[PDB]
């Protein structure tokens, strides 16, 4: 079935650097629906629901979401549809510490990954 490499991952990077957040996925024969990628963050305020960061949907990128990351998050692959939904986050701030989620869908296939990002 659809799966993602290292579905739980710890990443540490230094303040000011660029974090590479991997989301490399493997499709199965059944996954013949439309590819849909969603990244989310869990806010430091535990009373706030998760927020969307960036999408790949209908072969287009939508990035007008989480204000604190606006302009700093980009898909890294030049061929995302072939299995690479990774993103980077530039000029890391201590406030970027948190859990990031990558959701990869290609109906009926589904998989999710969580990354715990630590900024030093």
């Amino acid at each position: 079935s659809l799966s993602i490499t290292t579905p739980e991952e710890m990443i540490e990077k230094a303040k000011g650097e660029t974090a590479y957040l991997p989301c490399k996925f493997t499709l199965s024969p059944e996954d013949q629906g439309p590819l849909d990628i969603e990244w989310l963050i869990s806010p430091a305020d535990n009373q706030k629901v998760d927020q969307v960061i960036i999408l790949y949907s209908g072969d287009k990128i939508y990035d007008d979401y989480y204000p604190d990351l606006k302009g700093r998050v980009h898909f890294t692959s030049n061929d995302l549809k072939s299995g690479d939904a990774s993103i980077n986050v530039t000029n890391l701030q201590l406030s970027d510490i948190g859990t990031y989620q990558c959701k990869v869908k290609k109906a009926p296939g589904v998989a999710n990954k969580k990354i715990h990002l630590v900024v030093l």
């Binding site: 629906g33 849909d36 990628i37 629901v49 999408l55 939508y62 007008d64 869908k105 109906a107």
Partner: protein
């Protein structure tokens, strides 16, 4: 059988700006009644964080699902087509459906506007709660076959009376039913 948005959709709805919301809608056919379950999470844009101290006139907004004669969702609906389909597990079958007339709101039960005003029975009201908080009610008003430019429609209107200050618009779930076309 179940026609749905999936239970954990990526942004699939456009109200004020492209893909600003997640409508969760599950339709399960119980013969001549459809059992429906709905909620909304606004993720960006005008309706994301309500502040009626700064914006006192933001009190109501509407999401429309427009269907053709085959029960297929039209492009100009607020809801997107990509992940609106018959279920497979927790996702959808791979191929877009061609027919869903048995899930459409009945046109004799709920006629399109005409020289006759639509009866109130073409509407169902529910009260939902923003952020799951008991002191944050909002009203979901669902109307069947109100809209032009389609064969069938389901319209969801969200409104509130309280002066909310920095309240994220993400709702509890509401169940209703309606009479099926066939």
């Amino acid at each position: 059988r179940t026609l749905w948005t999936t239970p954990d959709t990526s942004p699939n709805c456009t109200i004020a700006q492209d893909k600003d919301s997640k409508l969760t809608l599950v339709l399960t056919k119980c013969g001549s009644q459809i059992l429906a379950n709905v909620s909304l999470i606004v993720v960006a844009g005008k309706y994301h964080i309500i502040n009626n101290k700064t914006n006192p006139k933001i009190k109501s907004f509407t999401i429309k699902l427009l269907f053709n004669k085959n029960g297929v969702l039209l492009d100009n609906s607020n809801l997107g087509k990509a992940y609106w389909n018959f279920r497979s597990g927790n996702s959808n079958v791979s191929t877009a459906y061609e027919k869903a007339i048995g899930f459409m709101p009945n046109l004799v039960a709920y006629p399109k506007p005409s020289n006759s005003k639509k009866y109130a029975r073409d509407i169902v009201y529910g009260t939902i709660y923003l952020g799951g908080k008991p002191d944050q009610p909002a009203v979901i008003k669902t109307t069947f076959n109100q809209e032009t430019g389609c064969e069938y429609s389901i319209t969801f209107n969200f409104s509130w009376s309280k002066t909310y200050e920095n309240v994220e618009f993400e709702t509890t779930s509401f169940t209703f039913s309606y009479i099926a076309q066939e």
